[PDB]
Amino acid sequence: ERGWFDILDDWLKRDRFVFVGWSGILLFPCAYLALGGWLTGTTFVTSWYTHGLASSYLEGCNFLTVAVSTPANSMGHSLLLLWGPEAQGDFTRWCQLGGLWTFIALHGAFGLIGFMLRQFEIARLVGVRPYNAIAFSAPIAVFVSVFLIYPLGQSSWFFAPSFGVAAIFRFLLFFQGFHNWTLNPFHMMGVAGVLGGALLCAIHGATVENTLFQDGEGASTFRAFNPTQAEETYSMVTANRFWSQIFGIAFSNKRWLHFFMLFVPVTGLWMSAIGVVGLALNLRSYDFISQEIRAAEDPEFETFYTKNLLLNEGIRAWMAPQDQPHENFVFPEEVLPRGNAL
Amino acid sequence: ESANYGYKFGQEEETYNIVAAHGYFGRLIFQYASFNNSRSLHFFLAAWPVVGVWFAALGISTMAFNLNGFNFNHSVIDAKGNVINTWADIINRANLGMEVMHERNAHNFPLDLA
Amino acid sequence: DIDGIREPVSGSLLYGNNIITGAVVPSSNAIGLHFYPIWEAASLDEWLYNGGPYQLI
Amino acid sequence: EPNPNRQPVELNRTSLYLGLLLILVLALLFSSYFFN
Amino acid sequence: MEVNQLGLIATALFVLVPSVFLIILYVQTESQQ
């Protein structure tokens, strides 16, 4: 039974410089379109009509300030299809209405799906376990929760992150001022996962590199390794003693070590994702009620928590009118919260 | 049983097939973006976060002397001279909120010079 | 009194903090970069008001 | 009759330490929010 | 401080139920030959 399906299968799984696979059918066009969409947008497209912002090279922005910005708040959660009722097939209007944002976000979503499918597909062809795909579930959770679920919980796509460097920085600052996101234990777990992951990366790499067996004569130790060699290239035993004596505890199991390196950042990212799903509903970790009761009654009570709330209040008042132009916030100078002198 | 029991502390032979991991990852991207050399791979794993965090530390350490982040506040201006806001300007609004509220009783003079 | 303006900030658990809000609070702005060991204080109470533990730590 | 599918369960000492550390640190983290 | 009083028991159980779980598993592991 060598029908067209099997022939096509043959061709798709050829060993070429760039492996295609069945997954490639989904992955390559969507990844290419998301990337191309971002490049196009950041080079040529404005955010004047949706945000009141210049956001492209064409307008004089640089790499840090260009963006593909979210659609106007008035678009709600419209898919903003090019042939949809808002753009009505007009490419130019579509660009001005923020259609590229949903374009990139959606092709990006399916592109990520394609990439993970590719991890599974290649894993299956080569005969390894699919832990790389499984690990990739964490970036997908992050993307889906931050770029899709979060704005879907809010009033519109407008409050999703915009695709740009400074635009993302704004997203960070917004999350501090409005969500008090640093106070969120899910974010905190995410931070532990990421910093702990970076830590593990460094300490594992460094340990290996400094417990190498001398398997060559040269001062460049890189040459003294052969990919098909059976022997471990560094001493697990010496590594273990060193760390046991330096830090008290050490890995003794390599498999557990590398599994742990998978586990820490993956789990961290998943936790942060859960927190953002909460923020979709403004289900924040904003306050400690006991602190507020005490502070409301007792004007001499001050903590870093109350200090930070004052900072958030500043962020909200000073950034809201320009950051949310559709709301038409007019905040006279006299209502702006300010400390002395500043 | 746990796959971890398949490794025994101090065993001389490697517990995974770096050639298979390379075949996989090389096909994931392309062959020449994958490490076949465990030493150079592990060196990379050491170097990337260490160098990165060195720069982070140097950031804090040089902003300690007030050489600050890029300022593109009002960098984009139209033909008449109207300020065209960019995301940098929105960032600046947030920053202003933080600045005016922090240490609300500590400043008597209009500039926060330290 | 972290910022040296006689406005003490509470950092410890016994004084109304939880794990998240708690802190050892930086020494006073009135001290600046001056070295403030325990023996430079007239009393432990002074040393604590002015944030000496921060410097020691 | 005895079920042939029964398997012994294990938790080694290192896993006990790791697990206890996880639970205690999680508690240390969440307790502030439980007290609120 | 007007904390939520359930916090206490919430924390206690949070620590105790899973810890105990681990302890059971560990001890019966040690008692196996």
């Binding site: 505890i249 | 065993q11 | 658990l13 939880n18 | 330490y17 640190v25 | 904390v3 009083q5 206490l8 620590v15």
Partner: peptide, 30 residues
Amino acid sequence: METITYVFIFACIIALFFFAIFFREPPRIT
């Protein structure tokens, strides 16, 4: 009560450090 709780959990963690370091499974070379 909260304070007692916080400090207790903390104290348990330090105790755990002690046991994990000094009463660990010895790594045994094979």
